[PDB]
UniProtKB/Swiss-Prot annotation, chain C:
Organism annotation: Homo sapiens (Human)
Signal sequence, renumbered to the chain: none
Identification of the protein by name: DNA-directed RNA polymerase III subunit RPC4
Coiled coil: none
Subunit structure: Component of the RNA polymerase III complex consisting of 17 subunits: a ten-subunit horseshoe-shaped catalytic core composed of POLR3A/RPC1, POLR3B/RPC2, POLR1C/RPAC1, POLR1D/RPAC2, POLR3K/RPC10, POLR2E/RPABC1, POLR2F/RPABC2, POLR2H/RPABC3, POLR2K/RPABC4 and POLR2L/RPABC5; a mobile stalk composed of two subunits POLR3H/RPC8 and CRCP/RPC9, protruding from the core and functioning primarily in transcription initiation; and additional subunits homologous to general transcription factors of the RNA polymerase II machinery, POLR3C/RPC3-POLR3F/RPC6-POLR3G/RPC7 heterotrimer required for transcription initiation and POLR3D/RPC4-POLR3E/RPC5 heterodimer involved in both transcription initiation and termination.
Record-listed cross-link Glycyl lysine isopeptide (Lys-Gly) (interchain with G-Cter in SUMO2), residues: 125
Top-level taxonomic group: Eukaryota
Residues of the full protein shown: 245 to 398 of 398
UniProtKB/Swiss-Prot annotation, chain D:
Keyword hit for Thylakoid: no
Family from the record: Belongs to the archaeal RpoM/eukaryotic RPA12/RPB9/RPC11 RNA polymerase family.
One GO biological process term: transcription by RNA polymerase III
Renumbered ranges of motif Hairpin: 88-89
This protein's name: DNA-directed RNA polymerase III subunit RPC10
Highest rank taxon of the organism: Eukaryota
Source organism of this protein record: Homo sapiens (Human)
MF (Gene Ontology): DNA-directed RNA polymerase activity; nucleic acid binding; zinc ion binding
Origin organism lineage: Eukaryota, Metazoa, Chordata, Craniata, Vertebrata
Annotated function: Core component of RNA polymerase III (Pol III) which synthesizes small non-coding RNAs using the four ribonucleoside triphosphates as substrates. Can mediate Pol I proofreading of the nascent RNA transcript. Anchors into the Pol III active site to constantly monitor transcription fidelity, cleaves mis-incorporated 5'-ribonucleotides and restarts the transcription process. Once Pol III reaches the poly(dT) termination signal, can induce Pol III clamp opening and transcription termination.
Main localisation: nucleus
PROSITE patterns linked to this entry: RNA_POL_M_15KD, ZF_TFIIS_1, ZF_TFIIS_2
UniProtKB/Swiss-Prot annotation, chain E:
Subcellular location: Nucleus; Cytoplasm, Cytosol
Gene name linked to the record: POLR3A
Species this chain originates from: Homo sapiens
Expression tissues: Expressed in the brain, in the cortex and the white matter (at protein level).
Disease: Leukodystrophy, hypomyelinating, 7, with or without oligodontia and/or hypogonadotropic hypogonadism: An autosomal recessive neurodegenerative disorder characterized by childhood onset of progressive motor decline manifest as spasticity, ataxia, tremor, and cerebellar signs, as well as mild cognitive regression. Other features may include hypodontia or oligodontia and hypogonadotropic hypogonadism. There is considerable inter- and intrafamilial variability. Wiedemann-Rautenstrauch syndrome: An autosomal recessive, neonatal progeroid disorder characterized by intrauterine growth retardation, failure to thrive, short stature, hypotonia, variable mental impairment, and a progeroid appearance. Clinical features include apparent macrocephaly, sparse hair, prominent scalp veins, entropion, greatly widened anterior fontanelles, malar hypoplasia, and generalized lipoatrophy. Death usually occurs in early childhood but survival to third decade has been reported.
Annotated protein name in UniProt: DNA-directed RNA polymerase III subunit RPC1
UniProt family annotation: Belongs to the RNA polymerase beta' chain family.
Chain residue ranges for the region called Bridging helix: 98-139
Swiss-Prot record, chain H:
Protein's UniProt name: DNA-directed RNA polymerase III subunit RPC2
Alphabetical UniProt keywords: Antiviral defense, Charcot-Marie-Tooth disease, Cytoplasm, Disease variant, DNA-directed RNA polymerase, Immunity, Innate immunity, Leukodystrophy, Magnesium, Metal-binding, Neurodegeneration, Neuropathy, Nucleotidyltransferase, Nucleus, Transcription, Transferase, Zinc, Zinc-finger
GO molecular function: DNA binding; DNA-directed RNA polymerase activity; DNA/RNA hybrid binding; ribonucleoside binding; zinc ion binding
Coverage span on the entire protein: 18 to 789 of 1133
Reactions listed under catalytic activity: RNA(n) + a ribonucleoside 5'-triphosphate = RNA(n+1) + diphosphate
Cofactor: how bound: Two Mg(2+) ions are coordinated by both the catalytic residues and the nucleic acid substrate to enhance substrate recognition and catalytic efficiency.
Family, as annotated: Belongs to the RNA polymerase beta chain family.
Site residues by UniProt (Critical in trapping poly(dT) in Pol III-mediated transcription termination): 404
Outcome of mutating residue 338 to K: In CMT1I; affects RNA polymerase III assembly; no effect on nuclear localization
Binding site for RNA: 169, 196, 413, 667
Subcellular localization: Nucleus; Cytoplasm, Cytosol
UniProt organism field: Homo sapiens
Length: 237, 400, 127, 107, 149, 99, 50, 764
DNA sequence: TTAAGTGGAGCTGGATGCTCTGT
DNA sequence: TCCAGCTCCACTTAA
RNA sequence: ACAGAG
């Protein structure tokens, strides 16, 4: 069937090639996740915002440097209206804790939480191939810190079904961390899968990886109109 | 759109034609002028124009970190030498400016002192960009490093060292500086004007637009090595200067096998000698059925090979001339098998005819253009001498 | 900021203010003249070959058109790239072999560009 | 923000002096005492979208309806046509059929 | 991208309502209709494409990409998203194609040719790996599948 | 394969030999179908080239009409007499003793 | 195969066992269905369906 | 009111094919080679001097080629026809004769006709015997009048130098790396040196990579080495927008970490990174003066005009990281075609420099040592270095030139004489640059840039699908131009010099750059007056009509391309919704008063380039003309090539059928020419009773196909008969094959040579 | 203070469809 | 032209 | 080493 055939997905010959090569990183990994309260989208956006990577610059309405005669620092004002509409669990104290994670080794004494929206980051000497004018480094690096969600998930999306007798809301996640998306509050972790067999082997065992190889080869063969008896892909897996 | 405003006179002065330069600073904005800072030395080389300046920066202002100035002055100078020294005191006192040469030719630039109602030009002798120098850090590193420790045909023109040795031979020329606030800056500023009347008709600039266009866009080749006698179908619509007119008729009639009389006046225009030229045109074309027809000698001299495939044939120009003679006596060539009477190939006759006519069914060919008037030009006698000459041509045909 | 034009350039220097201003205008490569007894070849004719006296007239037309009638031909004047750095117009005089005078005449703000009107030059005799 | 020395035109750095923080050149004595509040605001792009999708109308905004599939014959359909394999001299089609939510996808 | 989907919606309605209008007026004992009803050679897409309307010429699942700056060919205006400027043929193979429609249909055909040509080296190495890895397995007499070892 | 061009080449050729013309088949132009349909009726043939055809095996007429005309076939260089090949046992290589 | 200038190969087996493994296992009457999904391949084609 | 149509518009195509297009391409390149370029090669090598013992020299004055001759047994020479060179298995060449001036004590000893080699003369060129003859004089040369020529004869075989497709040299390519980073590059090709420089952003800071530097150095150190020392001037030249400065900042902050602040410091830093082949300062200064960006000229170590260029490169990298507008390698404004002349120029230059070096080595051996009698180098002018080089590099097809690092293989192929179309279809082939390295699917596709330049349908099927391509019917390839009046005109149209300005004007919204083949002519405001004035000066005839000008409104650059080897195509100028061509003009064309260049000079027909038809609007037919149209298509059937021009009604077929016909039509048995009986080839196929097609394209009339056709008109009934016609098989008539239908002839060859050995013995 | 075990980054070596048919 | 192993180098814990 | 064919 390879001679007949060739959220984006890869199908055809490169999909079968990525399956049988069994490499640790595939192009376009997709984690499909089920929700426990699949009734309405107000619950879906909460768990969507709990797993999708959100940057600090995406919620800050301005990030300013302030030079004073006694001290210099960097000020970040959070846009709490967007936090209200995106339904996120972030405020000043959580951003203070998301900073001091692998950024320049800032100290917790250097970061203050003066309001509920303002956060000032006073910098110190990097002292290793950098000038104390490293304020410019945090001017362009601090907007790329993560404050909420999983660092490996590029994007997540809400996908709704087609049936007329029901309406349930699943969650197609484009990422490469199965263990994290299974483990968040509100995601039905017993019924969520992946396309990358390496993550399924690492998390759920060798037998689930065998089942994943069977399902994924049969799915790719069905989507191009081919038809193989399941005993052949069973022997391959 | 008439010139509704400001018919402004434009003058020209030459008293500063070889003194005026233009110093521009690429790093300094237009607000922060150097009008206030005192100057110390002004150096120049007149040929290979390169200017070096030195400006004295103060120290009593708050913008001079004396802690860093003492260290940089200790770095560049010696500690207590002061025989020759970059800075005089124990501080960085001066800032040196170096020039870079913009262009080779400043012949086309002009400075314009716009007064009211008029405008005065003056050429520029040079255009120089002055940038702040960083040679003192290199001198500091020099003082810091000295404290620690039958030949072939050559290319010396394209080396940096020989170039610097060529530039080192010129002696410096020291200059007094005079700022913008001096009265001399107001005194010498009037030399950009010229003493002249309001209305003068210029002796120069008398050239025409087409001469000016030919001067700024010169012709590629002054004369070509070969000469085109024109057997190759060069541009008939281009009145080539070096071709005679009659040869442009020869090449045209070789192209356009039949043409009307009036097109000669339409292509040459009435400035040609349109009466004498018939002793030229008679040798290359003859009028038949109200129109011109190309003569035989233009197409094939008597040694030409067959121009087509199939069985080769030799040239026989009276085998053409008899055919064009038949168009002169009859209405047309009107019968089926003239190729048997004249013996040559049908592939000759039906190909020759195809450049002057179009076929109708059975009755040969149709003459492609209508019967214009012979008597448009004034000549009465040619109407009879043409019959004498075609009678002679017929008598020539009667030999074969 | 908007980009001013040559008719707005000459109006503000004439009507708005009486104060003079130093311009910096470029010319075409050859000026439409003969070098007057300069021992030639039909080479380039520049300002270094002409004499003092009136060289031409400047016509500001209706609707912003500005021409430089420099004899029988009219050139075209356009504002060049607008410089915003410092430019100083200086006189360097070598009155002696080893010493001389340097004097600053003023600051140059604007730059003008002259160019031949090729459509009008070509429409006299088409080719 | 980039600020440059009026003297030599190198880039200034912020450092601290004995009375104020200063912009200072690295190559000349020039310093500029920060006497009053000076600021530079970035104003970055917020995360503008929320992006719910996958609605049935977002699925059936394609031409085909009331045709016939060889499996379940239902009218509400979603078709596709391909030709980009010229080893296949015949045409190529694929069909989706979802009136009774049966969900076939064949050639 | 919303505009693209709506234009592909409106253009592909034209091929269906043009193709379901020609098949209603074809008589029986038509030869392509007989050859398409018995499935021997052809289909209804081919009959409706060489009588009624050649459809949208699609390259990589989308309309024809711009080869020049902001347009497909110089024959159309810049930033035009019309049907004719991005590869919608309106003619059939009976009435013949215009120059731009012929060039776009040739663009859509060379993709099929090049996918056929690339398909061969794309697949044969995969089958070589599968055969070299799976050639040892056998079904024994005790109903098990064992390797050679 | 949708070669309507052959189906029009046949009709243009049949309409061209019956009155002695060469109908053009130029790209993006050429002689239309509406003109060659009128040259076939004038010479007594059907206007779509389909002819009443008698079978030569049985002698009875065929039910459908058959589409006759001249089509320009060209002969290619691939002939079977240059490709039929066989070998019982013959010369072998020297390094690897195999044919 | 498509009969457009197509070349196919031939092999005459030279042993009795090479015959009988070719007739019983590899014959056309014993290979009507494909081993992939059990569908028949040797069946009618154009002008046998029409 | 309908727009009136000029009906004789098609006539512009038979008047075009008398002069340009249809193997006149190869001939106008080979004549260009043997008329000017062999004089430019001799001028570059006019004087040679032995290193030992000076005051002795050889001086070349003039070089010629002349008419083909053959050298025979008893030193009799004679002119030769190309068919005699086909039969006897020799090469068809004319002797290169150069005149010299050398020293034998008497300091001026001259010669005038010293034969130093033999140049293979291409058929129907300006020195072949066939050119300018009548058809009944081709008969005594045993030559067909319809043989297109454009090929060589080397040892009896007919070899064709194919058209090679390259990338345009000296052009900034902003592309994405494998890692996703956006970089830049320019293959700075000049005559003497080819090298690629880069611009990499591997850490958010800018490095510059070259094959001479063992580690890619930051860009601000390069600016400081090139004479601009203030960082403010660097940021002026890059850009004065806010986000541009924010993107460029970490490269200034990197350069301030090291102590580089002076040009001597920067040259000291760069000199200690040089791969060693005064060391520190001068081997860095000369490396920046002649190897990095070598097509940009520095005159007296004034590095201003190279700083502006590398600032343009860095600004394009920065502005391409913002929005992903990376350049494609497939737009044919960035392709250049290389004909036979531009290859034989490089080959002859390499062979000629090896000739001068071998003679200089011989002179260095014989002058200091042998004898006081003044030798001459005339006694050591062995001809067999030039002839063997030319013949071996044409006949084999490998072009190993050490001086230029070119190692092409498979350049020449044997001219295929299966039919007539096969011989004419090969003379329009374009091989590609990659040549099947991997299954690319990027250049194998059909780009829309090939409109009317290359054939949409004619391509091979298989591994070379979309890599071997064929020209259109009405295309033309430029030669290299003079560059005389372009700079002199451009400096009068208000182009300001780039030296009279800092870099800040490059960020203004009204200042465009004017390039000329990769070099900067300066800046300009109001670019539309420039473009219109330049096109009027081209239509009048002051600028050569193959000089195209264009505008890129995104990158704010105005390109002027005067280089050679790029595609052109004629069009009709349309002004205010009416074409410039009237019925009176076409009647004057048909009657003979004017030719095609008369349409060129009167601003009726101008040539467009692929870069310039990006800016124009072109109507196919007259009824498509609206107010924003500038050009009208002459004939739309010129879109198809030569092999696709046999197809009757090709716009009704599905598109792969035309490709299969472009493949199969070359293999049809037919006739070769009028000398097909006097010709002895390896394998010749003929048909006994050929017939010309009953339905024919105008292209068939143009290429004279029906003077010697390939095929027979078969009476075809379309029906299902007997069941032996299932998959593409067709039933024939037994009583038609007997009467002569399908009867072919197969001509083969068997040759045998009988040589004389060095030992006085011989075959018999 | 430093010994040590483990991350991340660059270098290296491997691979890229089956046959006939001719020069 | 794309992709697994091998080796080098900073970066914490732990004494 | 190149061109073909399926
Ligand atoms: Zn400074
Ligand atoms: Zn279904």
């Amino acid at each position: 069937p390879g001679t007949q055939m060739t959220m984006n997905i890869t199908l055809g010959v490169p999909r079968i090639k990525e399956i049988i090569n069994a490499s640790k990183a595939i192009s376009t990994p997709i984690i499909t996740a089920q929700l426990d309260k699949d009734d309405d989208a107000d619950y879906a956006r909460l768990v969507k915002g709990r797993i999708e990577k959100t940057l600090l610059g995406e919620i800050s309405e301005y990030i300013e440097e302030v030079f004073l005669p006694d001290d210099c620092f960097i000020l970040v004002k959070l846009s709490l209206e967007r936090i209200r509409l995106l339904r996120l669990e972030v405020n000043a104290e959580t951003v203070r804790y998301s900073i001091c994670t692998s950024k320049l080794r800032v100290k917790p004494g250097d970061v203050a939480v003066h309001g509920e929206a303002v956060v000032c980051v006073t910098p110190r000497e990097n002292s290793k191939s950098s000038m104390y004018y490293v304020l410019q480094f945090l001017k362009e690096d601090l907007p790329k810190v993560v404050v909420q969600g999983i660092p490996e998930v590029s994007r997540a999306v809400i996908h709704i079904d087609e049936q007329s007798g029901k309406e349930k809301y699943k969650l197609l996640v484009e990422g490469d961390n199965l263990r994290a998306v299974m483990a968040t509050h509100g995601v039905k972790g017993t019924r969520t899968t992946s396309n990358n067999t390496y993550e399924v082997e690492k998390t759920l065992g060798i037998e689930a990886a065998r089942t994943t190889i069977i399902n994924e080869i049969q799915y790719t063969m069905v989507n191009h109109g081919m038809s193989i008896d399941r005993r052949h892909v069973m022997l391959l897996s | 759109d008439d010139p509704v405003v400001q018919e402004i006179d434009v003058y020209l002065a030459k008293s500063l034609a070889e003194k005026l330069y233009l110093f521009q600073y690429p790093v300094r904005p237009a607000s922060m002028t150097y009008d206030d800072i005192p100057h110390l030395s002004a150096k120049i080389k007149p040929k290979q124009q390169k200017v070096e300046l030195e400006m004295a920066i103060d120290t009593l202002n708050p913008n001079y970190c004396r802690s860093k100035g003492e260290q940089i002055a200790l770095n560049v100078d010696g500690a207590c030498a002061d025989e020759t020294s970059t800075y005089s005191s124990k501080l960085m006192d001066k800032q040196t400016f170096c020039s870079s040469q913009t262009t080779s030719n400043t012949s086309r630039y002009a400075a314009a002192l716009y007064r009211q109602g008029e405008l005065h030009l003056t050429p520029l002798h040079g255009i120089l960009q002055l940038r702040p120098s960083f040679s003192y850090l290199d001198k500091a590193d020099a003082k810091h490093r000295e404290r620690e420790a039958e030949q072939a045909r050559q290319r010396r023109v394209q080396s940096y060292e020989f170039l610097q040795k060529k530039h080192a031979e010129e002696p410096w020329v020291h200059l007094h500086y005079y700022g913008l606030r001096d009265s001399r800056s107001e005194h010498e500023r009037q030399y950009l004007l010229c003493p002249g009347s309001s209305g003068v008709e210029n002796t120069e600039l008398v050239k025409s637009p087409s001469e000016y266009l030919m001067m700024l866009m010169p012709p590629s080749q002054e004369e070509e090595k070969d000469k085109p006698v024109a057997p190759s179908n060069v541009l008939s619509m281009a009145q080539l200067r070096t071709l005679p007119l009659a040869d442009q008729i020869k090449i045209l009639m070789k192209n356009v096998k039949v043409m009307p009389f009036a097109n000669l006046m339409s292509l040459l225009g009435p400035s040609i000698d349109s009466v004498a030229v018939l002793r030229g045109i008679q040798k290359v074309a003859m009028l038949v059925q109200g129109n011109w027809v190309v003569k035989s000698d233009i197409l094939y001299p008597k040694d030409s090979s067959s121009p087509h495939s199939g069985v080769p044939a030799e040239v026989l120009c009276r085998g053409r001339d008899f055919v064009m003679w038949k168009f002169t006596q009859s209405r047309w060539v009107v019968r089926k098998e003239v190729a048997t009477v004249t013996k040559l190939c049908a592939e000759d006759v039906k190909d020759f005819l195809e450049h002057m006519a179009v076929v109708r069914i059975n009755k040969g060919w149709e003459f492609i253009l209508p019967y214009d008037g012979e008597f448009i030009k004034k000549h009465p006698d040619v109407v009879q001498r043409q019959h004498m000459l075609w009678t002679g041509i017929q008598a020539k045909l009667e030999k074969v | 900021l908007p980009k001013d034009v040559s008719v707005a350039e000459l109006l503000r220097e004439l009507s708005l203010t009486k104060e003079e201003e130093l311009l910096f205008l470029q010319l075409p490569d050859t000026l439409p003249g003969q070098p007057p007894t300069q021992d030639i070849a039909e080479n380039a004719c520049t300002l270094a070959d002409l004499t003092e006296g009136q060289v031409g007239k400047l016509l500001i037309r209706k609707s912003g058109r500005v021409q430089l009638l420099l004899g029988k031909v009219t050139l075209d004047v356009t504002m060049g790239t607008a410089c915003s750095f410092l430019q100083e117009l200086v006189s360097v005089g070598l009155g002696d072999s080893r010493t001389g005078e340097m004097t600053v005449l003023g600051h140059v703000k604007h730059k003008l560009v002259c160019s031949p009107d090729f459509e009008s030059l070509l429409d006299h005799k088409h080719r | 923000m980039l600020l440059f020395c009026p003297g030599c035109g190198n880039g200034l750095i912020v450092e601290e002096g004995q009375r104020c923080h200063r912009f200072s050149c690295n190559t000349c004595p020039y310093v500029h005492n920060i006497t009053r509040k000076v600021t530079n605001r970035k104003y970055p792009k917020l995360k503008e979208v929320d992006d719910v999708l996958g609605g049935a109308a977002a699925w059936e905004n394609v031409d085909s309806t009331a045709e016939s599939c060889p499996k379940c014959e239902h009218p509400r359909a979603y078709f596709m046509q391909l030709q980009t394999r010229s080893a296949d001299e015949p045409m190529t089609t694929f069909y989706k059929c979802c009136n009774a939510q049966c969900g076939h996808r064949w050639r | 991208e919303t505009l693209e989907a709506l234009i592909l919606k409106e253009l592909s309605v034209i091929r269906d309502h043009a193709g379901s209008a020609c098949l209603r007026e074809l008589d029986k004992s038509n030869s392509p209709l007989t050859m398409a009803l018995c499935g021997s050679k052809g289909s209804f897409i081919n009959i409706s494409q060489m009588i009624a309307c050649v459809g949208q010429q699609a390259i990589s699942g989308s309309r024809v990409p711009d080869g020049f700056e902001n347009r497909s060919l110089p024959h159309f205006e810049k930033h035009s998203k019309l049907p004719a400027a991005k590869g919608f043929v309106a003619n059939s193979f009976y009435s013949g194609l215009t120059p731009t429609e012929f060039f776009f249909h040739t663009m859509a055909g060379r993709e099929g040719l090049v996918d056929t040509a690339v398909k061969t080296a794309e697949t044969g190495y995969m089958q070589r790996r599968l055969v070299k890895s799976l050639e040892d397995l056998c079904s024994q007499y005790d109903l098990t599948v064992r390797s050679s070892t | 394969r949708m070669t309507v061009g052959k189906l029009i080449e046949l009709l243009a050729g049949k309409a061209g030999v019956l009155d002695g013309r060469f109908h053009y088949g130029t790209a993006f132009g050429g002689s239309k179908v509406k003109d060659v349909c009128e040259d076939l009726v004038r010479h007594g043939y059907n206007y779509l080239g389909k002819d009443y055809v008698t079978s030569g095996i049985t002698g009875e007429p065929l039910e459908a009409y058959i589409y006759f005309g001249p089509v320009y076939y060209q002969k290619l260089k691939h002939m079977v007499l240059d490709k039929m090949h066989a070998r019982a046992r013959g010369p072998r290589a020297v390094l690897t003793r195999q044919p | 195969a498509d009969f457009d200038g197509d070349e196919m190969n031939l092999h005459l087996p030279q042993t009795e066992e090479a015959k009988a493994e070719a007739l019983v296992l590899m014959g056309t009457k014993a290979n009507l269905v494909t081993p992939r999904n059990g569908e028949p391949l040797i069946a009618a084609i154009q002008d046998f369906l029409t | 009111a309908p727009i009136p149509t000029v009906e004789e518009k098609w006539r512009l195509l038979p008047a075009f094919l008398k002069v340009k297009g249809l193997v006149k391409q190869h001939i106008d390149s080979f004549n260009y080679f043997i008329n000017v370029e062999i004089k430019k090669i001799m001028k570059a090598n006019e004087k040679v001097t032995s290193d030992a013992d000076p005051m002795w020299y050889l001086k070349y004055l003039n070089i010629y080629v002349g008419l083909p001759d053959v050298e025979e047994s008893f030193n009799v020479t004679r002119p030769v026809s190309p068919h005699e060179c086909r039969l006897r298995d020799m090469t068809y060449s004319a002797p290169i004769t150069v005149d010299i001036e050398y020293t034998r004590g008497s300091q001026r000893i001259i010669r005038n006709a010293l034969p130093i080699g033999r140049m293979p003369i291409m058929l129907r060129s300006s020195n072949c015997v066939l050119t300018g003859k009548t058809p009944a004089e081709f008969a005594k040369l045993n030559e067909c009048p319809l043989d297109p020529g454009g090929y060589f004869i080397v040892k009896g075989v007919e070899k064709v130098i194919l058209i090679q497709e390259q990338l345009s040299k000296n052009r900034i390519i902003v592309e994405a790396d494998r890692k996703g980073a956006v970089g830049a590059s320019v293959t700075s090709s000049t005559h003497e040196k080819k090298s690629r420089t880069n611009m990499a952003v591997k850490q958010g800071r800018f490095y510059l990579r070259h094959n001479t530097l063992s580690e890619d150095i930051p860009i601000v150190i390069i600016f400081k080495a090139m004479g601009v020392e203030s960082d403010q001037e660097i940021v002026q030249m890059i850009g004065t927008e806010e986000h541009v400065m924010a993107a460029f900042g970490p490269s200034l902050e990197e350069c301030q970490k090291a102590q580089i602040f002076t040009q001597m410091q920067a040259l000291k830093y760069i000199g200690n990174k040089v791969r060693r082949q005064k060391t520190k300062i001068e081997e860095a200064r000369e490396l920046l003066a002649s190897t990095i960006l070598t097509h940009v000229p520095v005159k007296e170590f004034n590095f201003r005009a190279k700083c502006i260029y590398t600032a343009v490169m860095v600004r394009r990298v920065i502005l391409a990281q913002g929005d992903n507008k990376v350049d494609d390698r497939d737009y044919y404004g960035n392709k250049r075609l290389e004909l036979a002349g531009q290859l034989l120029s490089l080959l002859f230059e390499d062979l000629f420099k090896k000739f001068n070096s071998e003679m200089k080595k011989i002179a260095d051996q014989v002058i200091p040592k042998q004898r006081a009698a003044q030798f001459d180098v005339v006694k050591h002018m062995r001809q067999d270095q030039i002839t063997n080089g030319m013949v071996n590099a044409i006949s084999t097809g490998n072009w190993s030139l050490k001086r230029f690092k070119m190692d092409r293989q498979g350049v020449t192929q044997v001219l295929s004489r299966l039919s007539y179309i096969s011989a004419l279809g090969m003379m329009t082939r374009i091989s590609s640059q990659f040549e099947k390295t991997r299954k690319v699917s990027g250049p194998r596709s059909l780009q829309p840039s090939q409109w009317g330049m290359l054939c949409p349908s004619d391509t091979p099927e298989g591994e070379a699908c979309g890599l071997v391509k064929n020209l259109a019917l009405m295309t033309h390839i430029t030669t290299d131009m003079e560059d005389g009046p372009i700079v002199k005109l451009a400096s009068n149209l208000g182009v300001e010099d780039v030296n009279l300005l800092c870099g800040e004007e490059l960020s203004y919204p009204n200042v465009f750059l004017v390039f000329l083949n990769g070099n900067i002519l300066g800046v300009i405001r109001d670019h539309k007056k420039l473009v219109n004035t330049f096109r009027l000066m081209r239509r009048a005839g002051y600028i050569n009509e193959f000089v195209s000008i264009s505008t890129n409104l995104t990158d704010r650059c105005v390109y002027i391309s005067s280089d050679g080897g790029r595609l052109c195509r004629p069009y009709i100028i349309v002004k205010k919704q009416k074409p410039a061509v009237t019925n009176k003009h076409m009647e004057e064309l048909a009657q003979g008063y004017r030719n095609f260049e008369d349409f060129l000079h009167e601003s009726l027909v101008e040539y467009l380039d692929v870069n310039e038809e990006n800016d124009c609007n072109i109507a196919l037919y007259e009824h498509t003309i609206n107010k924003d149209t500038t050009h009208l298509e002459i004939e739309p059937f010129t879109l198809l090539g030569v092999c696709a021009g046999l197809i009757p009604y090709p716009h009704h077929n599905q598109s792969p059928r035309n490709t299969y016909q472009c493949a199969m039509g070359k293999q049809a048995m037919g006739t070769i020419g009028y000398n097909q009986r006097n010709r002895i080839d390896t394998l010749m196929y003929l048909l006994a009773y050929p017939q010309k097609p009953m339905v024919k394209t105008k292209t068939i009339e143009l290429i004279e196909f029906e003077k010697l056709p390939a095929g027979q008109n078969a009476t075809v009934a379309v029906m299902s008969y007997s069941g032996y016609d299932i998959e593409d098989a067709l039933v024939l008539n037994k009583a038609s094959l007997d009467r002569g239908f399908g009867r072919c002839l197969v001509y083969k060859n068997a040759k045998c040579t009988l040589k004389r050995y060095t030992n006085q013995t011989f075959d018999k």
